[PDB]
Symmetry: C2
Subunit: 241 residues, 2 copies
């Protein structure tokens, strides 16, 4: 583990505070601008859609990535939520009401047992079965997110190879001739401190770089900084052009 404070410039430039963590898979070495914040545990908010998806597929609550989840007809503040979805679009638009229905069908007993098997954060689901990742007792750090994502990348979690390949498909965010990004955003607003997340990895021709970042997010105006500050660090380190 090594601390690079020069990355703080990318936060200062936007009058913002947070952490970026990087893990080089080939060399088995980690890098961060803030070793203490890298190990601070927060609510995961919509980054929980990665384990929630795995559990729903392995139990047969979701049959495949094409199954349609029909809109329930309740008009909500996010326009993209008021329509029919599948697993790929529900991930892409972070569709909370679809994932709340998955959690209710999984139930408390199976949810708790799967999170112990994954070694996920503080393993504590206290609160509503369909909101504990937004305003209950579960907590995870940036370094614990990387540990979990490394198991997913190598198909080492205790669910089928099929469930792991489908979720990695749903995480696809960007691809071109230089790199592929598989990742998930989050925004924790119900309990202080309000924060934004981006967790995932960068696939290159002959290496993989795992990342996890969080930052203070007192309003929704800064949400685009989650991806923009991470890409400034990846360019500085010569990982992407």
């Amino acid at each position: 583990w090594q601390e690079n404070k020069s990355w703080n410039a990318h936060f200062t430039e936007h009058k913002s505070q947070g952490v970026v963590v990087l893990w080089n898979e080939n060399k088995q070495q980690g890098f961060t601008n803030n070793l203490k914040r890298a190990n601070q545990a927060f609510l995961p908010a919509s980054t929980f859609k990665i384990p929630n998806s795995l559990i729903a597929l392995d139990l047969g609550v979701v049959k495949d990535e094409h199954q349609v989840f029909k809109w329930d007809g309740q008009t909500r503040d996010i326009a993209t939520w008021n329509r029919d979805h599948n697993l790929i679009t529900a991930m892409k638009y972070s569709v909370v009401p679809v994932y709340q229905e998955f959690a209710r069908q999984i139930g408390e007993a199976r949810m708790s047992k799967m999170l112990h098997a994954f070694d996920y954060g503080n393993e504590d689901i206290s609160g509503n079965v369909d909101s504990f990742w937004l305003d209950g007792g579960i907590r995870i750090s940036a370094t614990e997110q990387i540990s979990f994502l490394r198991k997913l990348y190598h198909n080492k979690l205790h669910v089928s190879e099929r469930s792991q390949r489908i979720v990695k498909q749903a995480m696809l965010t960007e691809a071109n001739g230089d790199y592929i990004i598989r990742a998930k955003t989050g925004y924790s607003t119900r309990i202080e401190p309000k924060i934004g997340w981006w967790v995932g990895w960068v696939e290159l021709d002959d290496n993989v770089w795992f990342f996890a970042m969080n930052m203070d997010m007192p309003t929704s105006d800064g949400l685009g900084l989650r991806q923009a500050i991470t890409k400034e660090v990846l360019k500085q380190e010569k990982i992407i052009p």
Copy 2:
């Protein structure tokens, strides 16, 4: 069912070239082309054959998974990216012919022919050398026959495992952003006249899929970038991509 749109010919004559683009709208079950005759003419598949060759190698266990390393044989070749170690993902991306020739020798003639019959792949004919028939033997396929094959792959309906189909669709990944995903493969046929370039694949949108297959005359390697550029001009004209 099928409609001819000759306005697309402007994207070929812009570059003093000749060719065909074929599109299929999965939701509406309707096809579109600039040239109904060329859309049904048969050509060597060249490196577009890496899609069925990958499926057969995985289903028979010649390739264990997308991480297995194929070591360079230490024979210096023309293309710098071929003179290094590869896995399935990088071998598809850089079109590494020597890696796929070794897959074909390990599959062998009898198993290769049985699987192309099971896929209904083009004329199903592997006559010629087992390690070069897709470059200079008897096999031929049309743009419309490429779409029929890719539709089966998209729906996991080919006669190989779901696993084999999922890994090959991962190796086909070409471009992704907030508007669309492209899964596809390039080809370049030079050993038999006429010399042609291919691009075959599909575009995934939020609520539809568009399949595509194009080929074009390719008298020199200088025009190879037009395979993708002319296809994307057609996709933009039809408002499929921004």
